[PDB]
Amino acid sequence: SKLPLLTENGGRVNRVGFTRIAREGSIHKFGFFYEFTQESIDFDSDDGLM
Amino acid sequence: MLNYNAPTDGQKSSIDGANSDQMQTFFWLKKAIITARKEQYFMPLASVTNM
Numbered sequence: 001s002k003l004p005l006l007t008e009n010g011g012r013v014n015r016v017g018f019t020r021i022a023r024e025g026s027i028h029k030f031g032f033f034y035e036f037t038q039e040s041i042d043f044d045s046d047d048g049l050m
Numbered sequence: 051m052l053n054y055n056a057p058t059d060g061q062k063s064s065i066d067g068a069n070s071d072q073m074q075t076f077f078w079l080k081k082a083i084i085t086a087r088k089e090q091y092f093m094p095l096a097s098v099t100n101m
Contacts (some may be wrong), residue, residue, distance in 0.1 A: 036052035
């Protein structure tokens with residue numbers, strides 16, 4: 001029922017259109033940290049703690 | 051803050067949990083303190099007669 005049939009006289013028939021889509025994506029910021037004192041390093045039993 | 055705290059007083063360091071502690075809380079000075087032998091004053095005064 002929707003075939004683009006064309007008669008012997010042509011005319012303004014079977015016009016079509018087109019479409020496009022847009023994708024998107026963003027970036028975000030991350031981070032974390034830890035603190036320590038000098039005594040927690042020098043007086044600790046394990047010298048490989050850091 | 052990661053603190054050493056005072057392990058010898060029961061204040062654990064931040065790194066140690068409920069089932070951990072400092073392996074070396076003190077340094078052992080291996081030279082012990084000893085007293086000298088008491089002096090003798092009467093033993094040198096004794097003459098010896100063989101039995």
